[PDB]
Paper text:
The frontline antitubercular drug isoniazid (INH) targets the mycobacterial enoyl-ACP reductase, InhA. Inhibition of InhA by INH–NAD results in impaired synthesis of mycolic acids. Here, we report the identification of the diazaborines as a new class of direct InhA inhibitors.
Compound screening against purified M. tuberculosis InhA identified three initial hits, AN2918 (6-aryloxy-benzoxaborole), AN3438 (5-aryloxy-benzoxaborole), and AN6534 (7-aryloxy-N-sulfonyldiazaborine), which had inhibitory concentration (IC50) values against the enzyme of 44, 12, and 79 μM, respectively. AN3438 and AN6534 had activity against whole-cell M. tuberculosis with IC90 of 16 and 36 μM, respectively. To understand the binding mechanism of these boron-containing inhibitors, co-crystal structures of AN2918 and AN3438 with InhA were solved to 2.5 and 2.55 Å, respectively. (iii) Similar to AN3438, the oxime group of AN12855 forms a hydrogen bond with Glu219 and stabilizes the salt bridge interactions between Arg195 and Glu219. To validate InhA as the target of this series, we isolated six M. tuberculosis strains with resistance against AN3438; the frequency of resistance for AN3438 was 6.5 × 10−7. Whole-genome sequencing of these strains identified single nucleotide polymorphisms (SNPs) in inhA; these were I16T, D148G, P151S, R195Q, I202T, and E219A.
Author numbering: 2 to 269
The structure:
């Protein structure tokens, strides 16, 4: 039976059925986890999407930029899972960068307000979610966030790369706080995944140069990866998250696990 059996896990970041978060939730549920889901803004759409998951699960609202949503999140979760119960797991699968700081726009022409909003949502929110939810987490529990390796610069990704560099630093401090509760904190640095958003870029929505750049990155990724890399398949990364959520990596924290086919270990 299941890898996450009898675990209570909060999963953020579902927006479509091609969301990495969607697959994380699916696999987790397939593995016996009992879930609490969170969503931003488009709650009617999200509710419809999440009905396509294997099992029923409460959907709660969370705009990570809303100080009231965060302050109330713990109480609202406890209500959904029942009093006298706590969370074993939390999944941060949230990211955003205005098109001004990421894509076709030059690196220098991103105005700070846009940059700041992206860091807020993509990095700081990892800390604020942890603050909100640690008091209602069990020992042995696990917090997991989604990363994209920012240790080297690349075209297009631009300020989102900077946000991921920030998020990695954030995760190391959150581990310090999380350790006090017997709770681990880690990032999964995933390889490129064809989300709906990504698929549109590949199809030319951000121009032919941008479409060409993403296509070079993907082809080179699969080449470099010793076991290959399938941009269309989010399942291997979801399993990696489930692994970190499980009891089978109990000594790992403040750390980054790479679900990228080994590509980052190879120059070419």
């Amino acid at each position: 039976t299941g890898l996450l059996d009898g675990k209570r896990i909060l999963v953020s970041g579902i927006i479509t059925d091609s969301s990495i978060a969607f697959h994380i939730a699916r696999v987790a549920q397939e593995q016996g986890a009992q879930l609490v889901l969170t969503g931003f803004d488009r709650l009617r759409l999200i509710q419809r999407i999440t009905d396509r998951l294997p099992a029923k699960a409460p959907l709660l609202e969370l705009d990570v930029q809303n100080e009231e949503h965060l302050a109330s999140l713990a109480g609202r979760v406890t209500e959904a899972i029942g009093a006298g119960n706590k969370l074993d797991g939390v999944v941060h699968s949230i990211g955003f960068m205005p098109q001004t700081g990421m894509g076709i726009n030059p690196f220098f022409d991103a105005p700070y307000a846009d940059v700041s909003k992206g860091i807020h949502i993509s990095a700081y929110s990892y800390a604020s979610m942890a603050k909100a939810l640690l008091p209602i987490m069990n020992p042995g529990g696990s917090i997991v966030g989604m990363d994209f390796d920012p240790s080297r610069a690349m075209p297009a990704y631009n300020w989102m790369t900077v946000a991921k560099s920030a998020l990695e630093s954030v995760n190391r401090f959150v581990a310090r706080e999380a350790g006090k509760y017997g709770v681990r904190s880690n990032l999964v640095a995933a390889g490129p995944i064809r989300t709906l958003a990504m698929s549109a870029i590949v199809g030319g929505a951000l121009g032919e140069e941008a479409g060409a750049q993403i296509q070079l990155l993907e082809e080179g990724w699969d080449q470099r990866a010793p076991i290959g890399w399938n941009m269309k398949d989010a399942t291997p990364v979801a399993k990696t998250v489930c692994a970190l959520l499980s009891d089978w990596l109990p000594a790992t924290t403040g750390d980054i696990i790479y679900a990228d086919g080994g590509a980052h270990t190879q120059l070419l």
